[PDB]
Design a protein around this ligand. Structure first.
Ligand SMILES: Cc1cn([C@H]2C[C@H](O)[C@@H](COP(=O)(O)OP(=O)(O)O[C@H]3O[C@H](CO)[C@@H](O)[C@H](O)[C@H]3O)O2)c(=O)[nH]c1=O
Ligand SMILES: Cc1cn([C@H]2C[C@H](O)[C@@H](COP(=O)(O)OP(=O)(O)O[C@H]3O[C@H](CO)[C@@H](O)[C@H](O)[C@H]3O)O2)c(=O)[nH]c1=O
Length: 288
């Protein structure tokens, strides 16, 4: 499976933070925001990944992450000339996707919880249909909202409904089979002027092929869309990492743990970083 990170947009709410930095280049505690959705695609077993951003920001992501060889993966880049909708990812990424299935993750989403790696690899290995991930939230009108059965069967899906049909947000992580490219070409802009991922999911729902996994109250799903929520997410990660010997979304660690790179290769990455705690972390891991 291939994966795309949609890592553009204006980040208007975070102004002036986003006047000269992409929202997805801002810190979440100790690492750039984009590390977090990238880690999710890596843990799903996805090694061929396209990162989409604005004309100004795309080369900044490429500066940060490179072509992926350090992580035993392939990273490519594409520009989105205007933030015209999530569904544009599959239009921009058409040549990249080819005939393959593809996962999409939103650049400003932070997922964390027990059992997630297993859940990801399951979804990544499903060959047909769309898999979306629901989460019970306080203000469901702020999100795509999914309404489902006692058996977990989807009934409806709506983008930012004024009257939400349930409390379950549709989070920014989606797994699709190859139909999604032609689906995305056939949707049209909503009232917000955007080619909506919710309309991609509606197409699968019409076919009876939209499948929801509920993440559960024990899972953390945050986004960094406001100054307050960005700061809370940073605090959340700090609290986790302080207690444990372990980092969240440490890309080099994940590359090693997923078998994408060797112990020796991890040492080589750790060497030029031994001057900081991050390199020290990687080196301790290599020597375990
Ligand atoms: C519209 C647009 C967005 N983006 C990036 C910026 C963010 O990292 C990410 C999500 O865009 P936002 O405009 O923040 O999305 P938002 O309105 O919060 O809602 C989206 O994300 C929510 C989950 O975070 C879902 O519940 C909604 O269904 C989904 O439409 O995509 C792009 O890179 N290109 C775009 O065209
Ligand atoms: C391995 C690894 C995980 N993660 C994140 C992904 C998840 O949000 C969170 C938990 O990841 P998991 O790999 O599912 O670990 P967790 O679910 O707490 O614990 C276990 O889940 C299963 C049941 O105990 C075990 O079979 C797994 O070996 C073990 O991982 O940590 C990272 O950010 N970095 C990592 O290197």
């Amino acid at each position: 499976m291939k994966g795309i990170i949609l890592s553009g947009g204006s980040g208007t709410r975070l102004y002036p933070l986003t006047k000269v930095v992409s929202k997805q280049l801002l810190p979440v505690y100790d690492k750039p925001m984009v590390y977090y959705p990238l880690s999710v695609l890596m843990l799903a077993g996805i090694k061929d990944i396209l990162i989409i951003s604005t004309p100004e920001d795309t080369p900044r992501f490429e500066q940060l992450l490179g072509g992926g060889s350090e992580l035993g993966i392939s990273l490519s880049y594409a520009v989105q000339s205007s933030p015209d909708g999530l569904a544009q990812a599959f239009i921009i990424g058409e040549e990249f996707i080819g005939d393959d299935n593809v996962a999409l993750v939103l650049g400003d989403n932070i997922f964390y919880g027990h059992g997630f790696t297993e859940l990801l690899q399951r979804a990544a290995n499903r060959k047909s249909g769309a898999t979306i991930f629901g989460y019970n939230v306080k203000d469901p009108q702020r999100f795509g909202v999914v309404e489902f059965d006692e058996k977990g069967k989807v009934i409806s899906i709506e983008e930012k409904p004024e009257e939400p049909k349930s409390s379950y947000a549709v989070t920014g992580l989606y797994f699709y089979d190859n139909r999604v490219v032609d689906i995305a070409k056939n949707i049209t802009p909503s009232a917000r002027g955007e080619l909506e991922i919710t309309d991609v999911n509606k197409a699968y729902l019409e076919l009876g092929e939209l499948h929801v996994e509920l993440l559960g109250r024990g899972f953390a799903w945050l986004d960094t869309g406001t100054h307050e929520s960005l700061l809370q997410a940073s605090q959340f990660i700090e609290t986790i990492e302080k207690r444990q010997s372990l980092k969240v979304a440490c890309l080099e660690e994940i590359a090693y743990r997923m078998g994408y790179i060797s112990r020796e290769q991890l040492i080589k990455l750790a060497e030029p970083l031994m001057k900081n705690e991050y390199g020290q972390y990687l080196m301790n891991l290599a020597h375990r």
